[PDB]
Amino acid sequence: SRKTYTLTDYLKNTYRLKLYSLRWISDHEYLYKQENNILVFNAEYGNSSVFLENSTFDEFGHSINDYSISPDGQFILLEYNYVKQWRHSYTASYDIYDLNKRQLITEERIPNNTQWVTWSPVGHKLAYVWNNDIYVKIEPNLPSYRITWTGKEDIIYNGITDWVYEEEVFSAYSALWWSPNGTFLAYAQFNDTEVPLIEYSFYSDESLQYPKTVRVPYPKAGAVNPTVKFFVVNTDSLSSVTNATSIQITAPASMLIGDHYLCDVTWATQERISLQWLRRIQNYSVMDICDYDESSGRWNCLVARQHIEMSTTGWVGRFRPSEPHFTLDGNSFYKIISNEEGYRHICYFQIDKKDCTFITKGTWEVIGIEALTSDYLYYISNEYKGMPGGRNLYKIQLSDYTKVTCLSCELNPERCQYYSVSFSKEAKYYQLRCSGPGLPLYTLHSSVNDKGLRVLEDNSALDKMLQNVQMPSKKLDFIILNETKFWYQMILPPHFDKSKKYPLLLDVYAGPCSQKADTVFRLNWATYLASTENIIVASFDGRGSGYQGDKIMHAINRRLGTFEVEDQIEAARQFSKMGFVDNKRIAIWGWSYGGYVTSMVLGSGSGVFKCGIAVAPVSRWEYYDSVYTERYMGLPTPEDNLDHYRNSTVMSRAENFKQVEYLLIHGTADDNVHFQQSAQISKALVDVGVDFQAMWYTDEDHGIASSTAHQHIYTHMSHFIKQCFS
Amino acid sequence: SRKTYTLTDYLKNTYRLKLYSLRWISDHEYLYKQENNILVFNAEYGNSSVFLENSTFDEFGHSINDYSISPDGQFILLEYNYVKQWRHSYTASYDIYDLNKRQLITEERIPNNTQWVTWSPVGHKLAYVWNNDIYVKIEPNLPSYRITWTGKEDIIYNGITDWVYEEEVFSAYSALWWSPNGTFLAYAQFNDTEVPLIEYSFYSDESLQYPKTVRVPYPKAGAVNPTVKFFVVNTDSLSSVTNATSIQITAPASMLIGDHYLCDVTWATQERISLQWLRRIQNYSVMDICDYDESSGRWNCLVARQHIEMSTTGWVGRFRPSEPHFTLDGNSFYKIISNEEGYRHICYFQIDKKDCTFITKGTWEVIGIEALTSDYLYYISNEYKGMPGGRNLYKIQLSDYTKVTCLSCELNPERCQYYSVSFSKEAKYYQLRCSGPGLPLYTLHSSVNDKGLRVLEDNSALDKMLQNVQMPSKKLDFIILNETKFWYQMILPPHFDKSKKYPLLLDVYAGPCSQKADTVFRLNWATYLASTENIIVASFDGRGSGYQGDKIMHAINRRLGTFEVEDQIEAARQFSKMGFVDNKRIAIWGWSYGGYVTSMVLGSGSGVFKCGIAVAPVSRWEYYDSVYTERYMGLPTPEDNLDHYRNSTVMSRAENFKQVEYLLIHGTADDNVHFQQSAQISKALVDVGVDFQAMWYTDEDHGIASSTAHQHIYTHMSHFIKQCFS
Ligand SMILES: CC(C)[C@@H](Nc1ccc(CNC(=O)[C@H]2SCCN2C(=O)C[C@H](N)Cc2cc(F)c(F)cc2F)cc1)C(=O)O
Ligand SMILES: CC(C)[C@@H](Nc1ccc(CNC(=O)[C@H]2SCCN2C(=O)C[C@H](N)Cc2cc(F)c(F)cc2F)cc1)C(=O)O
């Protein structure tokens, strides 16, 4: 009777998880693919018309993957030649197709090898970066206009984020920001002139005779940072002036004093724009609100309009200060910030009234400000049931702060405790995402009544297919320590016997403001081991975890590589004295930050573990970029915290590895955690004379994405864990 | 009773092998260290005086490792700051000490960071290369003279060999050649301008933040070769002319036609110099003999003086055409060359009489022309007992070629069958090196009587220390195949039972003109496994082995990666049907070329093996340098043998790896077999979905020399073999 979730049922991915990714084109209309054609749904009654045919693109000669329709619904952009670079950066070519005249444009097209292109919020104005310069077309068929000329590769990035501004701050490539009615366009430029490079080898296919040395700007902690500058241009007169005039916003003076960054820039009104500027020591940021001048033509920022935002126990925000959310008029806004008790709640500011008013309280951080009508503010947070990995949607009335209504609570909390959401334009309709504990369920809701229309995807298909197979189970809970409760979880095998000795495996990522303890239902490697192998996977959230207040998340400021690693072991301890946790067989594995921790853990004399696996792990903080590292360690100099970068290195513990069975794995083309860190980890043990299992993956970046490598790694880990155990 | 040669007794090296490395300063005097001081021995009676004190160098402030005394015995050069680069290249600083006035020189010293320095054969003239230029000092304290100014790093090498000219042709760095009476000096220059580079990462100690990208000129097979040029200068008038005039020798025309090299240049007389020039297709070389002109001042080469030397079945020579050996006058010489039957015997040439006369015959190649008095010619060869790995010294009389006397035959062939030798100047005394089968024995002999004076080192110390431990044993022999006998050998365990099933391990290097079957007595990793683990190590010489005629060595010309790999397995077969060779447990491991073979072997469908280990193995010949590769494969183009580079790639066999248990190991800073080859080997299996054991060694060059890495690797191999077996 029945089999289990094997490696193959995993790797080859037999059990599919149907989504329903849609994009609203208005306030009551969105677009949803259907494999062949692309239907256009009507938010309300759902009278699904067919927007664009599928066969209308066979004879294209190219392999097309993405599309982008302007507001006008008059042009579809076609993406192909996708060449991943970093996390979100990609270089490809695009073709514009005129929807109305049912014909494909031909002359004055977007250059091949572009870097980013986009529609403006309204109107089909196309802005784009190519060869590191910003060109803009008012009309598709018409020529174009170069807003910059200074653009010099791997030096001056116009309209696009360099390496570090991508991964750590914006988590995107798009360094341009269109204005509400497509009248203004604001970009961000970076002089990487003195920014240091990190070279390495790429080997391509067996045919390449001489390897290629990839050099890319990358400020490893304490090094030089690419100086930034912000501008704005009038996309209207640029067509009839010759050289489009590009006015620059500078300051804040509180930022000019030294090394600065650029947190999150967002418009408020057609002539009002708010820019958040962070300091290198990320405890002090300042938000600026500048408007447009009809006389002077310059963007002025009346000093009595800024909102200084500081932190006495660390950095500012979760991974950057959250984006403001202005009201319609544009003189009032809402930004999720750290409060007194250290919980992140929607403070309501005024463009001149310095202070604010938190329109929420308690011991439950708020996740994000989704929608904002001059009636309700639909946000997400971990309040219901009290748990941190519990995502829900609440709609607080802007007039009375007692009027706070949950919407995703009782939809079926027997199957849902984790959400996120997609709204229409005027937010007259929203699409909820139930991603756990049970199977994901996407559903539609009308806003004026907050009533549930219908079910867009119930996964009943996948579901019936899991009754034929003995799946595991997820016990998510908390343990008490130092008077505070910390959250962990266990992917328990089927037919769980709490009286027999089992082998444990700690799956730890646990990096600052993370969360390894949530109701999220995933069918990953954890799911295989738990079922087929009978190895209990477990993740613990300790003294650094986010979404649980600042007292928990900030307790690692500057002490990175101490508590979040101790707590892990202290956790491993708490499990030992639980019965089924067969002391003589406990494991710990981690990827990325997870590998780093899993590295400090092994070299602790803990002896709690028999073996361990670290994938692309950090091992000395000078080896990672500053915008992330400096935020949790200050500067690597004796005047700051250099003493600790040196204490928290996987290398100094190399000696205590003699007991364990370490297994290092690393992409030899990792843009993120440079192979370097792992090149020193090995050489560490080689010098201390300690055998260990090495395994490199050629050309593989930080995620060891490639189909083959992916299937490969998780295989080599299965052979390992099911050795060190069964 | 007794233990065995464990890993530790190996790695930590407990059992030492006393040598007796000496250097003759004349015809009856040499220098031999004594740890503290440095004694000077008298070749004859042996009345050992003490040359230089040890304490005379305490207060040196530096760490000194080497010394070099001029002929004059008037100056000692002191080496320190040794920075290994490649195989023989090294960069360090040197201090000259005046022996007579017992004082150290101070001003006008050798610049720090020099690249090579040397005494002339007579007189204390110092020639040296620094920053890629050739300077020469007549006197130590006096200034110096720059013979070149074109010297530009990683482009123009004056007085020093680039990467490829070091490893494959000269096996040295010294690209200058002093003339007999220090009157002339001849250098070799290299325009590496178009020579391609091979970059890679070096990571240094944990402190380096940004890795360093090592770029070095290196012509991988079929690429561009660094064009060479040869000169000569008058070290006498250079002191009194200003710019020392540097006359160039060009041609041969047979060489100007296309891509050429420079085999081996050697003087004959104060005004006679012979230069050997090879073609890119290494089957055709030409030796030139040019003299000095008193009128014209130019070095002329009367065409009727050259000695064309071609090969119809391969390249010319063993790894380069052997060096000529002229007679005193300088009009007659001896060069070991391939003869009719294809055996390398001392042909005797005349500077004008085109042909020659072989003063030796038979089925035993000659190793080398050691000494040459106008009486006898003391060479080495594998004639005695008929075996190939049998080295001995013979002294054939120049007047009668029947007068051929062995000297190292009966000294105790119960303990000796392998030699090599060090002669005095006028060869009035020679020091023999018995390196196998039993313990090494160094001894002295007088030449005028060829009588054995005394024993310089008998190893009786080490010896007595091997009676307390059960050492293995070495059965060296041959097997018959295709009517020809091929040589193999077995490092058999103690108390060998030829009736019980044992596990075998093929230790194969077997590359062109190599020898894995010889009477050499070594205490390496093989010795550990054989004893303690009871795994029978074995090496086989097949269809490519040298020292056994051309019919055996040349049978792989252009077919590299076919017979020498087949024969290996065919050999593995011959062992299987021998009893103790437990079929269900046979291994094969190889380093460098050895790993390559051991790679082709695994992917053969042979099924003969259960597992295998390859260290820094070649895996596609485009990945190695041309001067070595082109010699055994011609050029990688369809007009030559490109078709076969592609057949002989470890990658195409990636599929047949599913059965075996491959284990790849490779230095990540290998100047020789670039990590590249192994980066493709892995990616090969990753794509065919085949689990394998990877293990890289950071910064380690081709030999994984470093104490720690060395101990490490051989450990990781012991865990493996003693798993795949015991
Ligand atoms: C291991 C795998 C499953 C997957 N893990 C992973 C874990 C968490 C997240 C969520 N990201 C965020 O919330 C935001 S906000 C600013 C950018 N955020 C980031 O996390 C950027 C960091 N550079 C991520 C990172 C940190 C390290 F310390 C490190 F050594 C390597 C790294 F890649 C994404 C990925 C992965 O790493 O690709
Ligand atoms: C494996 C270890 C013990 C040891 N093996 C090794 C084997 C043989 C020799 C002796 N060399 C000679 O007689 C002459 S003459 C012209 C230069 N000769 C050479 O052999 C030059 C070749 N380039 C050597 C070589 C290197 C490689 F990396 C490779 F894959 C293949 C190769 F052939 C030295 C070392 C080692 O290579 O480090």
Side-chain angles (χ1 to χ4, degrees), chain B residues 504-508 565 568-569 586-590 594 597-599 601-602 609 611-614 721 725:
Chain B
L504 188 61
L505 206 183
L506 202 65
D507 172 320
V508 58
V565 62
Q568 221 57 53
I569 307 180
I586 325 164
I588 175 187
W589 93 275
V597 190
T598 286
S599 298
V601 180
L602 294 194
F609 312 100
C611 59
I613 286 177
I721 311 305
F725 287 152

PDB file of all heavy atoms in Angstrom, chain B residues 504-508 565 568-569 586-590 594 597-599 601-602 609 611-614 721 725:
ATOM      1  N   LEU B 504      44.095  -5.857  -5.604  1.00  0.00           N
ATOM      2  CA  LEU B 504      45.174  -5.253  -6.385  1.00  0.00           C
ATOM      3  C   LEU B 504      44.906  -3.767  -6.610  1.00  0.00           C
ATOM      4  O   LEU B 504      43.773  -3.290  -6.457  1.00  0.00           O
ATOM      5  CB  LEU B 504      45.313  -5.967  -7.742  1.00  0.00           C
ATOM      6  CG  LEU B 504      46.481  -5.659  -8.697  1.00  0.00           C
ATOM      7  CD1 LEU B 504      47.811  -5.983  -8.029  1.00  0.00           C
ATOM      8  CD2 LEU B 504      46.321  -6.491  -9.975  1.00  0.00           C
ATOM      9  N   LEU B 505      45.970  -3.048  -6.964  1.00  0.00           N
ATOM     10  CA  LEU B 505      45.898  -1.612  -7.226  1.00  0.00           C
ATOM     11  C   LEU B 505      46.958  -1.280  -8.268  1.00  0.00           C
ATOM     12  O   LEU B 505      48.153  -1.475  -8.036  1.00  0.00           O
ATOM     13  CB  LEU B 505      46.164  -0.807  -5.941  1.00  0.00           C
ATOM     14  CG  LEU B 505      45.567   0.605  -5.794  1.00  0.00           C
ATOM     15  CD1 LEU B 505      46.047   1.204  -4.478  1.00  0.00           C
ATOM     16  CD2 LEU B 505      45.967   1.486  -6.968  1.00  0.00           C
ATOM     17  N   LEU B 506      46.516  -0.804  -9.423  1.00  0.00           N
ATOM     18  CA  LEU B 506      47.450  -0.457 -10.480  1.00  0.00           C
ATOM     19  C   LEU B 506      47.857   0.986 -10.246  1.00  0.00           C
ATOM     20  O   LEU B 506      47.004   1.871 -10.165  1.00  0.00           O
ATOM     21  CB  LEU B 506      46.782  -0.609 -11.858  1.00  0.00           C
ATOM     22  CG  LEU B 506      47.673  -0.789 -13.099  1.00  0.00           C
ATOM     23  CD1 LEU B 506      48.423  -2.120 -13.010  1.00  0.00           C
ATOM     24  CD2 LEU B 506      46.822  -0.763 -14.359  1.00  0.00           C
ATOM     25  N   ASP B 507      49.154   1.205 -10.078  1.00  0.00           N
ATOM     26  CA  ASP B 507      49.698   2.543  -9.888  1.00  0.00           C
ATOM     27  C   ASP B 507      50.211   2.841 -11.275  1.00  0.00           C
ATOM     28  O   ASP B 507      51.284   2.379 -11.644  1.00  0.00           O
ATOM     29  CB  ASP B 507      50.874   2.519  -8.907  1.00  0.00           C
ATOM     30  CG  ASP B 507      51.606   3.859  -8.826  1.00  0.00           C
ATOM     31  OD1 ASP B 507      51.787   4.513  -9.882  1.00  0.00           O
ATOM     32  OD2 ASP B 507      52.011   4.245  -7.704  1.00  0.00           O
ATOM     33  N   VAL B 508      49.457   3.590 -12.060  1.00  0.00           N
ATOM     34  CA  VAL B 508      49.909   3.857 -13.401  1.00  0.00           C
ATOM     35  C   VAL B 508      50.172   5.324 -13.738  1.00  0.00           C
ATOM     36  O   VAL B 508      49.344   6.202 -13.485  1.00  0.00           O
ATOM     37  CB  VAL B 508      48.924   3.255 -14.436  1.00  0.00           C
ATOM     38  CG1 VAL B 508      47.541   3.820 -14.244  1.00  0.00           C
ATOM     39  CG2 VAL B 508      49.429   3.528 -15.830  1.00  0.00           C
ATOM     40  N   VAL B 565      46.655   2.945 -22.769  1.00  0.00           N
ATOM     41  CA  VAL B 565      45.521   2.850 -21.868  1.00  0.00           C
ATOM     42  C   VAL B 565      44.915   1.460 -22.034  1.00  0.00           C
ATOM     43  O   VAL B 565      44.446   0.858 -21.067  1.00  0.00           O
ATOM     44  CB  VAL B 565      44.476   3.945 -22.161  1.00  0.00           C
ATOM     45  CG1 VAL B 565      43.921   3.778 -23.552  1.00  0.00           C
ATOM     46  CG2 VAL B 565      43.381   3.907 -21.109  1.00  0.00           C
ATOM     47  N   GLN B 568      47.124  -1.085 -20.446  1.00  0.00           N
ATOM     48  CA  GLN B 568      46.993  -0.999 -19.010  1.00  0.00           C
ATOM     49  C   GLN B 568      45.933  -1.994 -18.551  1.00  0.00           C
ATOM     50  O   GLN B 568      46.154  -2.795 -17.632  1.00  0.00           O
ATOM     51  CB  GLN B 568      46.599   0.426 -18.623  1.00  0.00           C
ATOM     52  CG  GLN B 568      47.315   0.950 -17.388  1.00  0.00           C
ATOM     53  CD  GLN B 568      48.826   0.919 -17.535  1.00  0.00           C
ATOM     54  OE1 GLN B 568      49.380   1.445 -18.506  1.00  0.00           O
ATOM     55  NE2 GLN B 568      49.503   0.303 -16.567  1.00  0.00           N
ATOM     56  N   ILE B 569      44.785  -1.944 -19.218  1.00  0.00           N
ATOM     57  CA  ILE B 569      43.667  -2.823 -18.879  1.00  0.00           C
ATOM     58  C   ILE B 569      43.983  -4.267 -19.265  1.00  0.00           C
ATOM     59  O   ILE B 569      43.704  -5.197 -18.502  1.00  0.00           O
ATOM     60  CB  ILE B 569      42.360  -2.356 -19.577  1.00  0.00           C
ATOM     61  CG1 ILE B 569      42.100  -0.874 -19.263  1.00  0.00           C
ATOM     62  CG2 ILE B 569      41.184  -3.197 -19.082  1.00  0.00           C
ATOM     63  CD1 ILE B 569      40.849  -0.300 -19.900  1.00  0.00           C
ATOM     64  N   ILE B 586      39.690  -5.001  -8.004  1.00  0.00           N
ATOM     65  CA  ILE B 586      40.917  -4.499  -8.623  1.00  0.00           C
ATOM     66  C   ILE B 586      40.869  -2.986  -8.787  1.00  0.00           C
ATOM     67  O   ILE B 586      39.852  -2.441  -9.203  1.00  0.00           O
ATOM     68  CB  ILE B 586      41.135  -5.096 -10.010  1.00  0.00           C
ATOM     69  CG1 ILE B 586      40.649  -6.547 -10.041  1.00  0.00           C
ATOM     70  CG2 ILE B 586      42.610  -5.014 -10.364  1.00  0.00           C
ATOM     71  CD1 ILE B 586      40.470  -7.111 -11.447  1.00  0.00           C
ATOM     72  N   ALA B 587      41.973  -2.307  -8.492  1.00  0.00           N
ATOM     73  CA  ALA B 587      42.002  -0.849  -8.587  1.00  0.00           C
ATOM     74  C   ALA B 587      43.044  -0.296  -9.545  1.00  0.00           C
ATOM     75  O   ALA B 587      43.889  -1.016 -10.064  1.00  0.00           O
ATOM     76  CB  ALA B 587      42.220  -0.252  -7.202  1.00  0.00           C
ATOM     77  N   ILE B 588      42.970   1.009  -9.763  1.00  0.00           N
ATOM     78  CA  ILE B 588      43.896   1.714 -10.638  1.00  0.00           C
ATOM     79  C   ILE B 588      43.915   3.185 -10.210  1.00  0.00           C
ATOM     80  O   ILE B 588      42.862   3.814 -10.087  1.00  0.00           O
ATOM     81  CB  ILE B 588      43.448   1.607 -12.134  1.00  0.00           C
ATOM     82  CG1 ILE B 588      44.362   2.461 -13.025  1.00  0.00           C
ATOM     83  CG2 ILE B 588      41.975   2.020 -12.278  1.00  0.00           C
ATOM     84  CD1 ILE B 588      43.914   2.558 -14.474  1.00  0.00           C
ATOM     85  N   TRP B 589      45.099   3.721  -9.936  1.00  0.00           N
ATOM     86  CA  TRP B 589      45.206   5.124  -9.566  1.00  0.00           C
ATOM     87  C   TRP B 589      46.382   5.754 -10.303  1.00  0.00           C
ATOM     88  O   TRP B 589      47.368   5.078 -10.600  1.00  0.00           O
ATOM     89  CB  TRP B 589      45.358   5.290  -8.045  1.00  0.00           C
ATOM     90  CG  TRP B 589      46.777   5.365  -7.526  1.00  0.00           C
ATOM     91  CD1 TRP B 589      47.596   4.320  -7.207  1.00  0.00           C
ATOM     92  CD2 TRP B 589      47.528   6.562  -7.262  1.00  0.00           C
ATOM     93  NE1 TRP B 589      48.808   4.788  -6.762  1.00  0.00           N
ATOM     94  CE2 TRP B 589      48.795   6.161  -6.787  1.00  0.00           C
ATOM     95  CE3 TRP B 589      47.254   7.936  -7.386  1.00  0.00           C
ATOM     96  CZ2 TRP B 589      49.791   7.082  -6.433  1.00  0.00           C
ATOM     97  CZ3 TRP B 589      48.247   8.856  -7.035  1.00  0.00           C
ATOM     98  CH2 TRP B 589      49.498   8.418  -6.563  1.00  0.00           C
ATOM     99  N   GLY B 590      46.277   7.041 -10.621  1.00  0.00           N
ATOM    100  CA  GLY B 590      47.358   7.709 -11.326  1.00  0.00           C
ATOM    101  C   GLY B 590      47.387   9.203 -11.077  1.00  0.00           C
ATOM    102  O   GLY B 590      46.335   9.825 -10.908  1.00  0.00           O
ATOM    103  N   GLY B 594      49.246  10.075 -15.313  1.00  0.00           N
ATOM    104  CA  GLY B 594      48.708   8.883 -14.674  1.00  0.00           C
ATOM    105  C   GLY B 594      47.238   8.990 -14.370  1.00  0.00           C
ATOM    106  O   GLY B 594      46.503   8.018 -14.443  1.00  0.00           O
ATOM    107  N   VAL B 597      45.336   8.680 -17.846  1.00  0.00           N
ATOM    108  CA  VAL B 597      45.175   7.306 -18.245  1.00  0.00           C
ATOM    109  C   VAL B 597      44.098   6.645 -17.385  1.00  0.00           C
ATOM    110  O   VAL B 597      43.116   6.116 -17.905  1.00  0.00           O
ATOM    111  CB  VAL B 597      46.488   6.564 -18.106  1.00  0.00           C
ATOM    112  CG1 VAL B 597      46.352   5.205 -18.753  1.00  0.00           C
ATOM    113  CG2 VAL B 597      47.616   7.364 -18.749  1.00  0.00           C
ATOM    114  N   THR B 598      44.282   6.701 -16.068  1.00  0.00           N
ATOM    115  CA  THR B 598      43.348   6.132 -15.086  1.00  0.00           C
ATOM    116  C   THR B 598      41.911   6.625 -15.294  1.00  0.00           C
ATOM    117  O   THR B 598      40.972   6.080 -14.713  1.00  0.00           O
ATOM    118  CB  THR B 598      43.820   6.501 -13.665  1.00  0.00           C
ATOM    119  OG1 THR B 598      44.962   5.704 -13.331  1.00  0.00           O
ATOM    120  CG2 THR B 598      42.727   6.308 -12.653  1.00  0.00           C
ATOM    121  N   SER B 599      41.762   7.658 -16.128  1.00  0.00           N
ATOM    122  CA  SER B 599      40.462   8.269 -16.458  1.00  0.00           C
ATOM    123  C   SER B 599      39.841   7.604 -17.712  1.00  0.00           C
ATOM    124  O   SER B 599      38.630   7.319 -17.776  1.00  0.00           O
ATOM    125  CB  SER B 599      40.641   9.781 -16.724  1.00  0.00           C
ATOM    126  OG  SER B 599      41.127  10.487 -15.593  1.00  0.00           O
ATOM    127  N   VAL B 601      40.764   4.764 -18.727  1.00  0.00           N
ATOM    128  CA  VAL B 601      40.635   3.384 -18.287  1.00  0.00           C
ATOM    129  C   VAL B 601      39.266   3.173 -17.657  1.00  0.00           C
ATOM    130  O   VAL B 601      38.544   2.246 -18.039  1.00  0.00           O
ATOM    131  CB  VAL B 601      41.752   3.017 -17.260  1.00  0.00           C
ATOM    132  CG1 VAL B 601      41.608   1.573 -16.800  1.00  0.00           C
ATOM    133  CG2 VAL B 601      43.118   3.215 -17.893  1.00  0.00           C
ATOM    134  N   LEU B 602      38.895   4.031 -16.709  1.00  0.00           N
ATOM    135  CA  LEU B 602      37.599   3.869 -16.059  1.00  0.00           C
ATOM    136  C   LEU B 602      36.429   3.905 -17.056  1.00  0.00           C
ATOM    137  O   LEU B 602      35.483   3.107 -16.960  1.00  0.00           O
ATOM    138  CB  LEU B 602      37.407   4.926 -14.964  1.00  0.00           C
ATOM    139  CG  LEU B 602      38.310   4.909 -13.715  1.00  0.00           C
ATOM    140  CD1 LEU B 602      37.692   5.818 -12.650  1.00  0.00           C
ATOM    141  CD2 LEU B 602      38.446   3.499 -13.142  1.00  0.00           C
ATOM    142  N   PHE B 609      37.659  -2.854 -13.115  1.00  0.00           N
ATOM    143  CA  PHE B 609      37.828  -2.146 -11.850  1.00  0.00           C
ATOM    144  C   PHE B 609      36.559  -1.793 -11.060  1.00  0.00           C
ATOM    145  O   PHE B 609      35.470  -1.619 -11.613  1.00  0.00           O
ATOM    146  CB  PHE B 609      38.648  -0.885 -12.127  1.00  0.00           C
ATOM    147  CG  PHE B 609      39.881  -1.148 -12.960  1.00  0.00           C
ATOM    148  CD1 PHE B 609      39.888  -0.874 -14.329  1.00  0.00           C
ATOM    149  CD2 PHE B 609      41.024  -1.701 -12.378  1.00  0.00           C
ATOM    150  CE1 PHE B 609      41.008  -1.143 -15.100  1.00  0.00           C
ATOM    151  CE2 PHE B 609      42.149  -1.970 -13.142  1.00  0.00           C
ATOM    152  CZ  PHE B 609      42.141  -1.690 -14.508  1.00  0.00           C
ATOM    153  N   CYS B 611      36.841   0.728  -8.540  1.00  0.00           N
ATOM    154  CA  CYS B 611      36.957   2.162  -8.301  1.00  0.00           C
ATOM    155  C   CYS B 611      38.253   2.685  -8.921  1.00  0.00           C
ATOM    156  O   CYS B 611      38.998   1.921  -9.553  1.00  0.00           O
ATOM    157  CB  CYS B 611      36.892   2.478  -6.777  1.00  0.00           C
ATOM    158  SG  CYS B 611      38.177   1.686  -5.744  1.00  0.00           S
ATOM    159  N   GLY B 612      38.495   3.991  -8.751  1.00  0.00           N
ATOM    160  CA  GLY B 612      39.694   4.628  -9.275  1.00  0.00           C
ATOM    161  C   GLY B 612      39.905   6.041  -8.742  1.00  0.00           C
ATOM    162  O   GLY B 612      38.946   6.700  -8.343  1.00  0.00           O
ATOM    163  N   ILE B 613      41.164   6.495  -8.745  1.00  0.00           N
ATOM    164  CA  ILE B 613      41.554   7.835  -8.276  1.00  0.00           C
ATOM    165  C   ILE B 613      42.487   8.525  -9.285  1.00  0.00           C
ATOM    166  O   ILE B 613      43.539   7.991  -9.644  1.00  0.00           O
ATOM    167  CB  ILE B 613      42.284   7.772  -6.890  1.00  0.00           C
ATOM    168  CG1 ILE B 613      41.275   7.495  -5.770  1.00  0.00           C
ATOM    169  CG2 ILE B 613      42.996   9.072  -6.606  1.00  0.00           C
ATOM    170  CD1 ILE B 613      41.892   7.347  -4.392  1.00  0.00           C
ATOM    171  N   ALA B 614      42.101   9.712  -9.740  1.00  0.00           N
ATOM    172  CA  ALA B 614      42.907  10.472 -10.695  1.00  0.00           C
ATOM    173  C   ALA B 614      43.281  11.810 -10.057  1.00  0.00           C
ATOM    174  O   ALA B 614      42.410  12.526  -9.552  1.00  0.00           O
ATOM    175  CB  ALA B 614      42.116  10.697 -11.990  1.00  0.00           C
ATOM    176  N   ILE B 721      40.611   3.825  -0.735  1.00  0.00           N
ATOM    177  CA  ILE B 721      41.025   2.507  -1.153  1.00  0.00           C
ATOM    178  C   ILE B 721      40.706   1.486  -0.075  1.00  0.00           C
ATOM    179  O   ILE B 721      40.274   0.379  -0.386  1.00  0.00           O
ATOM    180  CB  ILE B 721      42.524   2.484  -1.440  1.00  0.00           C
ATOM    181  CG1 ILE B 721      42.888   3.658  -2.339  1.00  0.00           C
ATOM    182  CG2 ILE B 721      42.897   1.197  -2.131  1.00  0.00           C
ATOM    183  CD1 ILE B 721      42.077   3.700  -3.607  1.00  0.00           C
ATOM    184  N   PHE B 725      37.696  -1.526  -0.606  1.00  0.00           N
ATOM    185  CA  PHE B 725      38.273  -2.853  -0.377  1.00  0.00           C
ATOM    186  C   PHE B 725      37.900  -3.400   1.015  1.00  0.00           C
ATOM    187  O   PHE B 725      36.814  -3.970   1.202  1.00  0.00           O
ATOM    188  CB  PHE B 725      39.804  -2.812  -0.507  1.00  0.00           C
ATOM    189  CG  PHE B 725      40.306  -2.673  -1.919  1.00  0.00           C
ATOM    190  CD1 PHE B 725      41.526  -2.052  -2.174  1.00  0.00           C
ATOM    191  CD2 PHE B 725      39.609  -3.225  -2.989  1.00  0.00           C
ATOM    192  CE1 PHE B 725      42.053  -1.987  -3.469  1.00  0.00           C
ATOM    193  CE2 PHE B 725      40.124  -3.167  -4.290  1.00  0.00           C
ATOM    194  CZ  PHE B 725      41.349  -2.546  -4.528  1.00  0.00           C
TER     195      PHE B 725
END
